[PDB]
Ligand binder design. Structure first.
Ligand SMILES: NC(=O)c1ccc[n+]([C@@H]2O[C@H](COP(=O)([O-])OP(=O)(O)OC[C@H]3O[C@@H](n4cnc5c(N)ncnc54)[C@H](O)[C@@H]3O)[C@@H](O)[C@H]2O)c1
Ligand SMILES: NC(=O)c1ccc[n+]([C@@H]2O[C@H](COP(=O)([O-])OP(=O)(O)OC[C@H]3O[C@@H](n4cnc5c(N)ncnc54)[C@H](O)[C@@H]3O)[C@@H](O)[C@H]2O)c1
Ligand SMILES: O=C(O)[C@@H]1CCCCN1
Ligand SMILES: O=C(O)[C@@H]1CCCCN1
Lengths: 346, 354
């Protein structure tokens, strides 16, 4: 009958009401269970997503990401990757919204912010993969790219690993300078450090950069620690990669969405047969990751709509708890179904 | 650190006010004029057809489809219509078969700038498209309009065609007796005389016909192949699933056929049934060079309409212009734009009561 809209201010209230740590953990839990269900064949990976490339001011892409729950609802995330946004407009690079449509009737039932939600579920996905593939006594996090994702990468990982410090690099000096402030709520100290030092000293690394197509790697193939786990998070355009090939070829690599990663993720650099089990399989049967915490591992993260549906559910339950949001009659639902012009006055 | 951006939302009450303030006729005429100019632009090569739209089949309660329809104007904005075809809707839920919304995103930043009802808008630009094709392909003295399917689309087909042709009568059929029986009431505001008539009579008498039905896959045709007037123009409007068609093959093969979006029509329209050599020049071509419609008025013609996002963009602009002039709609901060672009957690709670 009406659309439930949660805006920027409701999303802020959700985070306050739940707590940043608890909210992240909720999403981590829901992702874990959902992924296991996919891994058991009980739910399906989202279909491949579509997109429109944009040249100006620098190259980006704008995408639609559907996920259907047959007989309940369709989720669609509409989201932009616009890497000039912070410097040119004071806007996040990743800018989006997430909509829910009733599957039986098509009606738009809910609409909310995609920015916070994307950051949270992306951080969560790394935590999921890192609980399986990083040493549980991991103490040093490395971060290449210290923009918006870096924050929830650090946050999420600090919740599943006993992190004591983060060594961080960004090619924009102002962005690496501000990271300690943005990270300080998590209690993990932060030290700026060049890619070679991060490689050599980190136990777990997340790369989440706006690197250009064809300009990788963002982490050099120097010595790494034997047990290093890398969450490879950066991903927008085809031809965009973050890690060096020689590193990928020696790694146990798991993808979030193998078909998508082979096209848009680090797995662009590999053939399918060289991938370990996908993330959903590992979630469904964690013992299949058994010795991999102690050897070189890569989680190839690209993002997919199921993760957004799950995260949106978490938000909606919290917002329901505290009746946040407004209700807007957006759709024209004429009482006369058959009359476009039955516009409604009582 | 720019001006705080929010989403301009026009809900059902706002679209209703636009119609009331501008007037029905004037509003439809505006849409026809903007579709006309835009199609000519595509026909001159100054703009491009929308890309193929996407969609998710649904089985239950009866077979249906939910689609996303993008159109991008580079460096300007992206339009996305999200829309359901759910044909059990009216008779199982009392909802419109076609249920949708139209959203606009800034092309430079990705920001969601506007969002409105898709229901009225879809109906208006779809009637408008048929008006465009019918001005080109119907006899300009056409007096008798046929309608097969008397649901939501039928209403704007009649309305739009009444503005471009001297329509005197509408002969109308629906396989659901309740839906054809209510049609006159819904059509009354056009002034055009309505009579219920079987498909064979509609075929025999009409100068122009619109088919706009929820016929199921494999269950066509909705108009039988039995003798029409030599000059008949048909706006073939029904379209959802592959395997859904409304016209007899035989008839299509006697007609000058023009599609709105050929690549799309060849897959999802009446041209599903046809090999590509049986299509004439597309609608955009005809709009850009009407002489290419020469002589087609006096013989059998078919406009194979499927709908495409460009039409929704243009219609949405007409609506936004009228809403801006009349101060309508609300402003909602939907997207989180943190004061620090690189800090997802730089959040702003509802300010405290003072
Ligand atoms: N895997 C997923 O699910 C997922 C989800 C969201 C975003 N992303 C992607 O993650 C990437 C980052 O997104 P974001 O929101 O943090 O954007 P952002 O602009 O806030 O952060 C990008 C940062 O990378 C830095 N950078 C660019 N090139 C670099 C290089 N060669 N070395 C080090 N730093 C470099 C920039 O200076 C900037 O600080 C994008 O590609 C985005 O599409 C992935
Ligand atoms: N081409 C476009 O741009 C465009 C735009 C919108 C909708 N559509 C399509 O137009 C069609 C109709 O949409 P609507 O909004 O009017 O749906 P509606 O449900 O409002 O009207 C459909 C009518 O068709 C009737 N019907 C079903 N089978 C029939 C038959 N064999 N003969 C006569 N009537 C029959 C139903 O009884 C119903 O009354 C759908 O296929 C829809 O997807 C096309
Ligand atoms: O899953 C996501 O939200 C992002 C959007 C941008 C490119 C792909 N990864
Ligand atoms: O163009 C449209 O709006 C419709 C939507 C439903 C099926 C396809 N045609």
């Amino acid at each position: 009958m009406e659309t439930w809209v949660l805006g920027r201010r409701d999303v802020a209230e959700v985070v306050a009401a739940v707590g940043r740590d608890e909210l992240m953990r909720r999403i981590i839990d829901r992702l874990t269970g959902g992924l296991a269900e996919i891994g058991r064949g009980e739910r399906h990976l989202s279909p491949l997503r579509g997109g429109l490339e944009r040249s100006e001011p620098v190259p980006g892409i704008w995408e639609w990401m559907p996920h259907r729950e047959p007989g309940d609802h369709i989720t669609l995330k509409t989201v932009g990757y616009s890497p000039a946004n912070p410097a040119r407009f004071g806007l996040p690079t990743i800018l989006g919204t997430v909509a829910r449509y009733d599957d039986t009737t098509g009606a738009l039932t809910a609409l909310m912010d995609g920015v916070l939600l994307t950051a949270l579920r992306t951080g969560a996905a790394s935590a999921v993969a890192s609980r399986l593939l990083a040493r549980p006594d991991s103490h040093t996090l490395g971060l290449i790219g210290t923009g918006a994702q870096a924050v929830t990468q650090l946050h999420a990982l600090s919740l599943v690993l006993p992190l004591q410090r983060a060594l961080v690099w960004d090619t924009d000096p102002a962005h690496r300078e501000s990271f300690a402030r943005r990270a300080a709520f998590t209690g993990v100290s932060v030290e700026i450090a060049e890619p070679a030092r991060i490689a050599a000293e980190a136990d777990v690394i997340s790369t989440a950069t706006s690197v250009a197509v064809g300009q990788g790697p963002v982490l050099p193939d120097t010595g790494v620690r034997e047990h290093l786990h890398i969450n490879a998070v950066g991903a927008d355009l085809v031809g965009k990669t973050e890690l060096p090939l020689g590193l990928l070829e020696r790694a146990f690599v798991t993808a979030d969405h193998p078909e998508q990663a082979l096209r848009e993720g680090e797995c662009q650099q590999l053939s399918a047969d060289r991938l370990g089990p996908q993330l959903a399989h590992l979630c469904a049967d964690p013992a299949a990751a058994a010795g991999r915490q102690d050897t070189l591992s890569v989680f190839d993260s690209t993002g997919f709509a199921f993760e957004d549906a799950l995260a949106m559910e978490v938000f909606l339950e919290a917002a329901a708890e505290r009746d946040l949001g407004i209700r807007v009659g957006i759709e024209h639902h004429p009482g006369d179904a058959l009359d476009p012009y039955a516009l409604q006055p009582l």
